[PDB]
Amino acid sequence: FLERMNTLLANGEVPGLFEGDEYATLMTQCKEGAQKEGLMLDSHEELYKWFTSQVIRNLHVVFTMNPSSEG
Amino acid sequence: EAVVRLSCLPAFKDLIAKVQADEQFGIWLDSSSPEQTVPYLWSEETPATPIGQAIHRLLLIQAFRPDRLLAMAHMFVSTNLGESFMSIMEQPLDLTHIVGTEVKPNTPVLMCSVPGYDASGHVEDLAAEQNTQITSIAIGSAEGFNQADKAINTAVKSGRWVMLKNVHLAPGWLMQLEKKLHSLQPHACFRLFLTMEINPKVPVNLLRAGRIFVFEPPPGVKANMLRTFSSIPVSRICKSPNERARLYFLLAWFHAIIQERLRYAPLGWSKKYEFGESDLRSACDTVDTWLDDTAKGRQNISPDKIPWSALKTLMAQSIYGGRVDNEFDQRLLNTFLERLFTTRSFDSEFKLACKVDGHKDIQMPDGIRREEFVQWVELLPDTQTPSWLGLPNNAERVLLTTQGVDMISKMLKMQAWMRTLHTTASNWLHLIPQTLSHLKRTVENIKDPLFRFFEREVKMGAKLLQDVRQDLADVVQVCEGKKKQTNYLRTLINELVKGILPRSWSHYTVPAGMTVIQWVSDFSERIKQLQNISLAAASGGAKELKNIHVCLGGLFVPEAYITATRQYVAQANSWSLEELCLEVNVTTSQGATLDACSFGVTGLKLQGATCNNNKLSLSNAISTALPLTQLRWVKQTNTEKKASVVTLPVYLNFTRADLIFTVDFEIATKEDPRSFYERGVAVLCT
Amino acid sequence: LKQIREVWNTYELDLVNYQNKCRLIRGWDDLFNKVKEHINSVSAMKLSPYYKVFEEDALSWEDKLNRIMALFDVWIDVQRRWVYLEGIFTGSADIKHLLPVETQRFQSISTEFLALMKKVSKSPLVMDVLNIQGVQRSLERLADLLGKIQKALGEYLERERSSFPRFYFVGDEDLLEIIGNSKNVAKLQKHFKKMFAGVSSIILNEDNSVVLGISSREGEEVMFKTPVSITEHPKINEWLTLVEKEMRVTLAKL
Amino acid sequence: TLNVLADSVLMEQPPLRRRKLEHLITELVHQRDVTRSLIKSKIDNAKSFEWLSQMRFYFDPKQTDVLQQLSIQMANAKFNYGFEYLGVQDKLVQTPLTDRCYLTMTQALEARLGGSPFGPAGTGKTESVKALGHQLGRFVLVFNCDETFDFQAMGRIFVGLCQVGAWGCFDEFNRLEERMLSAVSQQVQCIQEALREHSNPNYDKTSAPITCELLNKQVKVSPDMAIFITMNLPDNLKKLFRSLAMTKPDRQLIAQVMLYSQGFRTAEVLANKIVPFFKLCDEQLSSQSHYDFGLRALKSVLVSAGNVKRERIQKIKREIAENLPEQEILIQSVCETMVPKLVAEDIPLLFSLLSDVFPGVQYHRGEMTALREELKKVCQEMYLTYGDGEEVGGMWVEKVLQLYQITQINHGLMMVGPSGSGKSMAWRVLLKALERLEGVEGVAHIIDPKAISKDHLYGTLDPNTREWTDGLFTHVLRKIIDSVRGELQKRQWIVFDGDVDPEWVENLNSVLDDNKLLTLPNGERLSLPPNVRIMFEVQDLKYATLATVSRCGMVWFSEDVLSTDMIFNNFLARLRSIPLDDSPMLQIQRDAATIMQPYFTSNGLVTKALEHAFQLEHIMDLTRLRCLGSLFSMLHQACRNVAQYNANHPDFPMQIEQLERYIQRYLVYAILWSLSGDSRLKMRAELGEYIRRITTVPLPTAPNIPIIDYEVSISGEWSPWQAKVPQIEVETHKVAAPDVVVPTLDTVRHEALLYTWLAEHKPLVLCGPPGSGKTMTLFSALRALPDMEVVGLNFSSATTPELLLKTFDHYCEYRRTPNGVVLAPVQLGKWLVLFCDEINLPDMDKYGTQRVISFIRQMVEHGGFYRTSDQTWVKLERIQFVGACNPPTD
Ligand SMILES: Nc1ncnc2c1ncn2[C@@H]1O[C@H](COP(=O)(O)OP(=O)(O)OP(=O)(O)O)[C@@H](O)[C@H]1O
Ligand SMILES: Nc1ncnc2c1ncn2[C@@H]1O[C@H](COP(=O)(O)OP(=O)(O)O)[C@@H](O)[C@H]1O
Ligand SMILES: Nc1ncnc2c1ncn2[C@@H]1O[C@H](COP(=O)(O)OP(=O)(O)O)[C@@H](O)[C@H]1O
């Protein structure tokens, strides 16, 4: 979990998450979102970059922790 | 030193001054039991309560004659709880009263026995006197588990006393039994007995939920011999030539002697060997087979025809020497077997043990049937000194002192502490010497084996000193709170508070379990001698190293020192290493001149013997100091050693677990080597 | 339940080829964990009070999930046993002559199993194959037959290992190789090393029909005083026992 | 008979007859001591124990039963001889300890008990049990209880021991963990209790054979079988097993008997010298995990000494005659086996101990002039330094010769030493020299473990289809064995460069031994052809099992074999010959080398600076090769600055005068930034101050400013960095925005070093406290380069080489074998840099190896890796690595 959040926070994208059918479906929904948000559809890599930037500007992760500094 | 520490106590301010007078103090100190009457040495005017005098005398006994500490503690318990408090333990326990009334049928009676002992006979006699049937069951068979379970199921509804034999073999089935015993039992007469030896793998849950009875083999040769004679069938000892009865008596004597010497493990046989009933059965089988082979018929065969060599060799090399690890315990096993198993053992004046209790002897029973040997054994005196075993009489004092220290340690472990840990760590830092220097290395002295050994020793000592200083200063810093402890520091504190030596501080051989304060003290002494060695090496390169009167006990690897001395002597001449043998000269004056091949060592202690000039003689006072023991390497002539010399092992600790080397000593004109071997004489570095 | 009603509509069996050029099922983890998750979800929803949108949508599919689970957790055992026994019966020779009834029963069983595999391959849909009648009963029959024939193979291995007890030092696969390659004796020489202490080879005749002696790692030969002919003792255990006996006798005479 | 045997072992014998001879010397020596003891003891009666305690043999041909013709009696035991052919085996010297073991074990066998020898490992408990079992002709099995213990097999193994009459020995039975120990103890107890009833007083004659229960069924127990439990014991077996203390064997007696069986006159003196020497080597020599001074090593040294003596006498014959010095032959055998494993500190110690135990005699080494000449030709063209003794390069060539000797003897060689020693160079030069001298081609397969999964190293079976797919090493072994392609005339050296680890050598333990066969999970066996050598090029043996280290010989490459002078010679030889641009470049390189030669000598500027920098403090552990390589890369850039200067100025090229003053100052600049570029500013100032007092290169005039603050420019002048920091005014919308850098002192010099070390395509790691500006300093130089495209990549604890693999698949394409498979970026002409965020973050394994770090090292050093799909070597074309990390103390 922390390994995934490391990439979700530092870079905002998780590379080893969307593979195969999930990747294609994500491309479909994100290109549809680009069309309904007035955004021009681009190549797969540029569309993925736009999706990652959309995640950057539309995702906030909050961590709540024990005040135990040893943890 | 004990007087000084006791004088530190406020109740004994005047203790040197008061012991100056009262010339009876020496007689009291030499008294056999100086706890019945103890001189008044505490400075108290008004207090006269019995408890106060008892505890003051207890502290005095800890100071003077600590071997009587057990007896003094017994009298202290007598004063604080009446002179009948422990007497219930002396009488033989009666299982009927305990089991009938205050043992619930839910609770299983645990028939705990020390290994080498069986306790089924007690409850068998219990059932015989109470005429209650027992469904005794042996544990270990796969079908035995099902049979025991069926007996449990069919006995709870009828209250039949179930018995399991050696149930400690199976821990998982015992867990299952403990879990299932929570279910209620219809019958109240039910009593469940688990006979099991003292094995640490036995479930703790069973121990909590059951009544634990501990049985031990009563100490003594007489009890051991009664036990052995009861174990051996009457038929197996009576048949064949009548000499087999005396052979069995001799075997029982030997087995009892070697088991009662196990109690005096340091001074007896170096380590606690397992000499249970299996070895005695094997020896009995050996005697049976060899008397059958030698004496085919039933005639009274002559003792000269007894296969003495076969029995001695088989019991020294195969069934009793098969568990002996080192050379010297094997040598003493051989000494016992030669002394006992001989054709002279069938005479009438043959002594089982000489020098016993000063000048008396233990005679052979002139018997032909097992009955007369048994009657002789039961006629043995109740009093038994360690001299029965060949050991000196003060082995009892040594054992009693060890037991007293063990009781003190147990009570100490049966007892915020930031400040106490801080002050003890600061005291250690103050007492422990500063860093160790090894700033001498020239090309010409790399050839010197002594320099190489001393350099490696000083380097290892300096590294370990730096590690100990850093860790202990870290502990100090954590004590005030300006530094935060970690996992290594946490376990270090856990070890230091309980006074157990940290595993990271152990890099040289130390006795198996000792107080950290003793470790710090001997570490400080070792560092001090290493600083002296380094100073000598700074003063001179190859002249002072030879003239170092080094303390062999303080070296981390003294065997490496012996090897380096041999190497140095080999290089000094054209001789090779294997062409040298060690010659040892004990002197009196510390300023004795050292020869070219001679090497002086200090701190060696001789156990159970003393030397006038260089000739050993037996002494009742153990730990005789050897001042300036000189080690000489000489060209060996490959000749046989005479019969007037003994080879003593040289151990490093009070415990005899590691050999450094062996020293040959000329004994006096009266003593014989066998007595030295059986008295446990050795040389100790510490 | 929305995703549950559609996950079964699109679900391939993911067929794979075999060394015998036959179709098999490789997917088992996704075929068990997903079904268990779906059945747990439908059980929770039926138990849960919040179900007044799905008054009857999972009871008609809970039995479907149970049928899937039973069919396929029998199918996995069936296919594993079948591939293991196929390897045993095809890799080693003389399996037709030795245990003929077992071999013919396994041939009929393999014919039925391959027919079933062709049927499931023609329609690689799990719904399309659950609708086929008789699949469950045929599968349980097939599994029980496989169990019996595997037990019989184990019993035969035990009875052949009981004779010439040196076979207890080799595994099941090694002993199957030993007892199957009766004609190709040259493959036995790799197993004599573990069955004996020092014997590594057997000195055979020119046509490898008479055992003239034994050999070792170094190459030291022990010619038999009386050679044993495998022709007169065709069974392998018989002439192996005779080789051991003649080795003892030859050592004694020498 | 002993004299005839000893005269017949000096001459030439076949190996089988040699072993028969040696067995005969062993027995006849034992008989000689036994008879001599009987004579000295004045034994007259034949029933006396002193004779009756010896193993005695009674043979009666008249009996018709084969098994009972020979009877063996020890003291009162009467065993028959199991007439089972043992082969040739190996014979133990009957020392008094071995005699006591025989007596005790035979007594245990008559009592229907078991034998339980105990003591330290290497004493001979298992071998003594096996020797006793072979003396009685029984089929003895040894079960290794430390590891590779097949529990499922033991059920039928015990039944085989029962129904055959075979023995069983458990080597280090206590090494078993409690779970399997308890069940093995239960089975052993069942067997022992079944066997104890064979000696029933009332049921001695067993009409019905006694059976036990092992496989949930009754199995007959033959009286001939036995079980032995060697240790280093459970309460089940305490009452059913006799124990013997095998603490210390008689090494002097074993050595003397073995030497006498090797034909050595005065074998007693040689034994009583060599045994104390092996004792000293365990005390005076520093403890290493690979040192073996035990009994097995002593026996190996003794047999090698016998071979050496026979070689000497047969060489003298072709020029009875027994006048050779035996001690010098023994010393050569010791030194030809122990010196290669010795660390540099122990080498003088070994000869000091040799002069102690064997005074006066000296060790003379085989010259091998034939190979030492082809080494001079393989070197001097690979730009390496050659030596012939105390001269420079002597230690390295001696290590190469020792490596050659071990390759001749063993087949699983293991080159071990601190990183930076010439291990890889040694074995490469040896391979080329062997190919030249013997005319046999040498092909090296550098398989890197810990970079791929063990499944991809060997292979696995899919539990559904049961199809077998081979791993990397397995496929290499297939291509060596199955396909010939000059098999016997190609030297296949499968170097396992990396870190040694138990997990991937479990399968190799069957290959390193004399078996030379690999057992696969599918059951197939592949036998290693004799030309194959399994070479382990590793840095240390901290995490190597005793089995793997003891199963193969080795040569230790200490850090002292490769001196700094050798590395400087390599740098200058490559500089003068290899063009930096792949003709004027060579000329300027030779001029630079000539100018900078007096500093790259023994002592001098670079050596003194490196020695002084080693006593400073750096953020990372200081490695000599790291600083030297960074210095060499910077100096290589200093020779490209001249190339660009000449290109920009076709007329008036910089002559030797300008070049000299440029490179003298650039050498100091590169020394300062390479030997102290990983340390604090105070350490940099200290190194500069030390340089100022030991150099003759003109330095900055101002003493109050450190040399680290200046630049050499191109005119050979110290231009301060502060003169090259512009004053920029960023527009308002770009205030503190990402990827906005304001020039300063650090960003103008670190950028210079990044340009220097990226123009070489050399991997680098930026180390510093968090937020100090490592990432910003890099991207201010990467994206400035037009063709240096950057691929963002983040390293965490769970990072594995598969991350790099997916990055390569997404951004790079595999060329269809132009010359082998080559991994190249999708776009042409552009270089990919994989920025390594927190390169030291990945988790330390339990065996001290980060898999991803080793994976990227494989392709930094060897220029590629191995695909896991077809097990073929793929080569990186235009892939570059850059790292960044916080200090390791964090
Ligand atoms: N005479 C020489 N012989 C060998 N290497 C030399 C010599 N002179 C200089 N060198 C340099 O020393 C290094 C030798 O290290 P080598 O590549 O053999 O080590 P490795 O075993 O691959 O790795 P590591 O030392 O990190 O374990 C190379 O950089 C080589 O250029
Ligand atoms: N009496 C002996 N004579 C000759 N070699 C011996 C003798 N005792 C032990 N050895 C050698 O010692 C080596 C290791 O002995 P081993 O049986 O492994 O001891 P352990 O089982 O106690 O580790 C063996 O290779 C063996 O050849
Ligand atoms: N010239 C400069 N020197 C140092 N730091 C700077 C400079 N200009 C900007 N910074 C700031 O320093 C920070 C360093 O960030 P970053 O490169 O992520 O640190 P690191 O690479 O050490 O993790 C940046 O956020 C940047 O805003």
Short mmCIF file of C-alpha atoms in Angstrom, two decimals, chain C residues 16-19 24-28 79-80 83 158 161-162 165-166 168-171 190 194-199 214-216 218-222 244 247-249 251-253, chain D residues 16 19-20 59 66-67 69 82-89 134 138-141 153 155-157 159-161 163-164 166 215 217 219 462-468 515 523 525:
data_model
loop_
_atom_site.label_atom_id
_atom_site.label_comp_id
_atom_site.label_asym_id
_atom_site.label_seq_id
_atom_site.Cartn_x
_atom_site.Cartn_y
_atom_site.Cartn_z
CA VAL C 16 -4.30 -24.22 -23.55
CA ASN C 17 -2.57 -26.81 -25.69
CA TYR C 18 -1.02 -30.00 -24.33
CA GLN C 19 2.00 -32.11 -25.23
CA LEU C 24 -6.83 -28.02 -21.16
CA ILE C 25 -7.82 -25.34 -18.66
CA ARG C 26 -5.01 -23.24 -17.16
CA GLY C 27 -7.03 -20.67 -15.21
CA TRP C 28 -7.79 -21.74 -11.65
CA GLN C 79 -7.33 -32.82 -14.98
CA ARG C 80 -4.34 -33.06 -12.63
CA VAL C 83 -2.21 -35.45 -16.90
CA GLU C 158 4.19 -51.51 -3.75
CA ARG C 161 8.83 -53.05 -4.61
CA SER C 162 8.13 -55.71 -1.97
CA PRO C 165 13.48 -54.92 -1.63
CA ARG C 166 16.29 -52.75 -3.02
CA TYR C 168 12.66 -49.15 -1.59
CA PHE C 169 15.70 -46.90 -2.14
CA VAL C 170 14.26 -45.34 -5.33
CA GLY C 171 11.29 -43.06 -5.89
CA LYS C 190 21.71 -44.86 -13.96
CA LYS C 194 21.52 -45.77 -5.42
CA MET C 195 20.28 -49.38 -5.18
CA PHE C 196 23.73 -50.77 -4.27
CA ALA C 197 26.99 -49.68 -2.62
CA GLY C 198 29.57 -49.74 -5.39
CA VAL C 199 27.64 -51.45 -8.16
CA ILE C 214 28.70 -56.06 -12.55
CA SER C 215 30.97 -53.00 -12.55
CA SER C 216 31.73 -49.96 -10.41
CA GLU C 218 36.18 -46.81 -11.25
CA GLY C 219 35.57 -49.55 -13.80
CA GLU C 220 36.36 -52.63 -11.75
CA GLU C 221 34.50 -55.64 -13.15
CA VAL C 222 33.14 -58.68 -11.32
CA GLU C 244 22.16 -59.86 -6.47
CA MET C 247 26.98 -61.22 -7.06
CA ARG C 248 27.05 -62.57 -3.51
CA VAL C 249 28.01 -66.04 -4.72
CA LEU C 251 32.19 -62.59 -4.27
CA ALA C 252 32.26 -65.65 -2.00
CA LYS C 253 33.97 -67.91 -4.56
CA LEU D 16 43.13 -49.13 -9.48
CA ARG D 19 44.42 -48.00 -4.60
CA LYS D 20 44.65 -51.76 -3.98
CA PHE D 59 36.70 -68.15 6.82
CA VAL D 66 27.08 -68.21 0.86
CA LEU D 67 26.41 -65.71 3.64
CA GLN D 69 31.27 -68.76 5.00
CA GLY D 82 27.34 -59.55 3.73
CA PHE D 83 28.88 -60.55 0.40
CA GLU D 84 27.81 -57.33 -1.29
CA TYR D 85 30.29 -55.77 -3.70
CA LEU D 86 31.47 -52.47 -2.21
CA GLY D 87 33.40 -51.27 -5.25
CA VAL D 88 36.75 -49.77 -4.23
CA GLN D 89 35.68 -47.10 -1.71
CA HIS D 134 31.89 -51.92 4.93
CA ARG D 138 26.88 -54.34 4.74
CA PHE D 139 25.19 -51.83 2.42
CA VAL D 140 25.58 -48.65 4.47
CA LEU D 141 23.51 -45.55 3.73
CA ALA D 153 11.76 -40.81 1.20
CA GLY D 155 9.41 -43.95 5.10
CA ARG D 156 10.39 -46.34 2.32
CA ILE D 157 14.11 -46.01 3.06
CA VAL D 159 11.57 -50.36 4.99
CA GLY D 160 14.41 -50.97 2.55
CA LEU D 161 16.93 -51.09 5.39
CA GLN D 163 13.98 -55.89 4.21
CA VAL D 164 17.51 -55.73 2.76
CA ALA D 166 21.32 -52.57 5.13
CA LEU D 215 4.23 -47.51 6.35
CA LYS D 217 1.66 -51.85 7.72
CA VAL D 219 7.26 -55.02 7.64
CA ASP D 462 3.28 -25.34 -14.76
CA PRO D 463 1.07 -27.45 -12.46
CA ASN D 464 -1.67 -27.67 -15.12
CA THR D 465 0.00 -28.45 -18.46
CA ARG D 466 3.25 -29.86 -17.00
CA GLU D 467 5.25 -28.32 -19.87
CA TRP D 468 8.92 -27.71 -19.07
CA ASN D 515 28.70 -35.85 -9.85
CA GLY D 523 13.43 -35.20 -13.39
CA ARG D 525 19.58 -34.96 -15.66
#
